[PDB]
Enzyme design. Structure first.
Site, PDB file in Angstrom:
ATOM      1  N   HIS A 139      71.440   5.110  44.233  1.00 11.79           N
ATOM      2  CA  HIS A 139      70.602   6.189  44.706  1.00 11.79           C
ATOM      3  C   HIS A 139      70.118   7.074  43.575  1.00 11.79           C
ATOM      4  O   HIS A 139      69.799   8.240  43.792  1.00 11.79           O
ATOM      5  CB  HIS A 139      71.382   7.016  45.748  1.00 11.79           C
ATOM      6  CG  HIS A 139      71.776   6.235  46.973  1.00 11.79           C
ATOM      7  ND1 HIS A 139      70.912   6.003  48.022  1.00 11.79           N
ATOM      8  CD2 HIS A 139      72.927   5.591  47.285  1.00 11.79           C
ATOM      9  CE1 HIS A 139      71.515   5.250  48.924  1.00 11.79           C
ATOM     10  NE2 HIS A 139      72.737   4.986  48.501  1.00 11.79           N
ATOM     11  N   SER A 167      72.140  -0.289  50.439  1.00  9.47           N
ATOM     12  CA  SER A 167      72.059   0.955  51.174  1.00  9.47           C
ATOM     13  C   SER A 167      70.603   1.355  51.347  1.00  9.47           C
ATOM     14  O   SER A 167      69.867   1.491  50.370  1.00  9.47           O
ATOM     15  CB  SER A 167      72.848   2.051  50.437  1.00  9.47           C
ATOM     16  OG  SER A 167      72.858   3.258  51.170  1.00  9.47           O
ATOM     17  N   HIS A 189      63.526   4.264  49.674  1.00  9.58           N
ATOM     18  CA  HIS A 189      64.154   3.319  48.759  1.00  9.58           C
ATOM     19  C   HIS A 189      65.417   2.647  49.295  1.00  9.58           C
ATOM     20  O   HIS A 189      66.047   3.108  50.257  1.00  9.58           O
ATOM     21  CB  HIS A 189      64.466   3.995  47.405  1.00  9.58           C
ATOM     22  CG  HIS A 189      65.694   4.862  47.410  1.00  9.58           C
ATOM     23  ND1 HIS A 189      65.783   6.036  48.131  1.00  9.58           N
ATOM     24  CD2 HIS A 189      66.882   4.726  46.771  1.00  9.58           C
ATOM     25  CE1 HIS A 189      66.972   6.582  47.938  1.00  9.58           C
ATOM     26  NE2 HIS A 189      67.658   5.806  47.117  1.00  9.58           N
TER      27      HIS A 189
END
Lengths: 232, 225, 225, 232
Positions: free
Chosen positions: D45, D113, D136
């Site tokens: 992330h 994720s 994303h």
């Protein structure tokens, strides 16, 4: 002033070697009969390596038996040193209490060897039997005669138990020649100990083909218990 | 008094190990490289039994080679004493010109042993190899590695000849590191014990035989086996 | 810029090993003795990750204690960076005054590891003990020994307090070896890989818990577990 | 210029978490429908850790599927370095050919994720369905949704075989969005790679209780073959 005891057969008939020189004429044997005077106990046939004294030899339906004792203080302390610097001495075939000096004896000098001299040249026949003179018994890496493997201990009682083929009559009396000889005086510092000569003798014992397998057969031939302090 | 040379292969790929720890990694090999300072030459691995110094180790299509020299006067006179009291030393396997000190070396401490210091836990697989530090080479009764059967002598020229499969290139140069380099009583009791231990090995003499055969040394040498 | 202190038990008899090689011999212990020269303080055992130096090791009725110090500026600023990017570092188990560099140390490299160089073959059971050479102590994810849970801090006084069972006699003197002593970028890629490996351990957090309990360090400390 | 492929389910219904936030409204899902524009593929992330791009997400009777590709040269070489310095990457659960970059991916960043933003504050309901925007997909040590475990490879053909619960209809077409996206230009040196930020992210992954045992259940939930390059 604590001493060890060396016992075992120097010659057995059920373990006869192919060499006839080794053969001892039972005639000269019973000629030298009992306890005239003890016989010098040496290390590897080294006259300068006396560590004790043989206080009697006896006969059996099994063979000639020799009982001696190691009284060399400086040698008794050597087996002590040597012990914790020798993995072979320390390790045991079968678990038993930690016995320094004796476990070293069994790794260093396993067998017994009876040497005799011969007036040789003038030749004799003690009205039946050819002349020879017992001059000493030596502790060695391997005696020439089979079943010569010894046993070391603090008391004959226990040391003689190992030889079940030992007529109690001999053992009973042999336990006395020990107390008898215990009158011997004191002779410390008699010959330091030929460490150099001893190492050489130890080197020779490095080139013995099938020695551990021969020391096995010897404990069996002497019919000594498989739960002994011996290393083979 | 002069000094004796010890030469032979400490490890020979042509004569492999049956276990894993006795393996050498070419990694550590090219790591230690030539010389740093001399290497302590000990007896039966006894730190208090230093008798000389290793002046170089080299590689061969055949294996690792070790060149050392014995300079301890007290040990040089010991092979002297020991000789006239050692029947195995005195007696030769084949007829060759009597050689006290040397004959003793071959019956007493014939093999070579390369010892290396290793980490407790995997410490530095330097992704160029596994980590190990060469601390010393010892002369012993019978090395744990094969082809270890060493050669003792007075002059390297002759001492190094015994090795067929050894490349002349290294021998030629090694004879120089010797001249280049040319710039603890001896716990007899501990040594005897070490000699006692040697008395309890299976197939030692027969193993020393295969060693001189594998290390490519002639029958006409001073090997007691 | 100042330096951080790392303290804790590398080995605690009260918290034993399940295997044999992870045992320490009081022999080698009294052999290495106090100090020789400083000891290299490395990361995850990386020889190229030296961040400080061990200035002494001592014995206790409880076990072996290690005192070291981190002085690498490039690593001191790394615990700086790392802190505002490490949620596990930022978040505390119990409410305590924020401590960047230190909080990072406890989440990244909490344990201590004592590495020793050992011989290839039994080399010198110096009949006074087995042979081993202490070459370095590393800070890692989770030591293979127990009670290894280390303590990081700015001043030894406070840093050494965390250890109940530690004798005041050593702590009092250790605070002096520090002042006494007061006289490789960092293969981030190799460090990440080392951190990756830590991601694959069973019961790490729960093991680090038992460690602070066994090493007798309070709940009111900066241990992330 | 060789690139990896990242595939797996970012969300499965048979692996629903107890947290309702994670729940994705299938309505917003089919709202974002197909390939508008690819989605940024990042590491943990980290907006500054872009390593590739997601070239399509799809639905199944199993769950939402995401297909992406790693095109970061400087990151692709990092998995290379990292590999021979990571025992966990090198060792294999089950024997298989030595595959550097990918074996590193599986030890370093196992799961997937899917993160979405929400215009949040102005609130919406796309005439049935609450607003959200896919910004994303990140590769992580463990995704929040179960059965998110990925698969890395050089060819989708092989990479998609692992998901037997993947309707051939999706797989057949997904193999095309890959060639289609292969028109993308070139964007090297976009952000070195926050080695420091990455290490921190790796540190956080050291305090995950029962992570390897959870990655196990994930490969099972995704019904990926037990002979995979995965580490758990």
């Amino acid at each position: 002033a604590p001493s060890v005891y060396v016992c075992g057969f120097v010659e057995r008939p059920d373990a006869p070697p192919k060499d006839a020189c080794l053969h001892l004429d039972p005639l000269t044997v019973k000629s030298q009969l009992p306890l005239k005077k003890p016989l010098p106990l040496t290390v590897e046939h080294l006259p300068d390596a006396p560590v004790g004294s043989v206080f009697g030899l006896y006969q059996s339906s099994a063979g000639l038996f020799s009982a001696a004792s190691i009284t060399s203080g400086d040698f008794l302390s050597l087996l002590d040193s040597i012990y914790h610097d020798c993995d072979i001495a320390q390790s045991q075939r079968l678990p038993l209490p930690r016995e320094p000096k004796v476990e070293a004896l069994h790794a260093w000098l396993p067998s017994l060897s009876l040497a005799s001299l011969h007036p040789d040249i003038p030749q004799t026949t003690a009205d039946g039997g050819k002349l020879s003179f017992f001059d000493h018994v030596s502790i060695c890496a391997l005696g020439r005669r089979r079943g010569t493997t010894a046993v070391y201990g603090t008391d004959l009682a226990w040391v003689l138990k190992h030889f079940s083929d030992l007529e109690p009559s001999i053992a009973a009396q042999i336990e006395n020649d020990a107390n008898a000889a215990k009158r011997e005086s004191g002779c410390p510092e008699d010959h330091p100990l030929p460490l150099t000569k001893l190492i050489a003798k130890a080197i020779d014992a490095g080139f013995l083909r099938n020695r551990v397998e021969t020391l096995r057969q010897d404990r069996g031939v002497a019919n000594i218990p498989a739960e002994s302090y011996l290393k083979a």
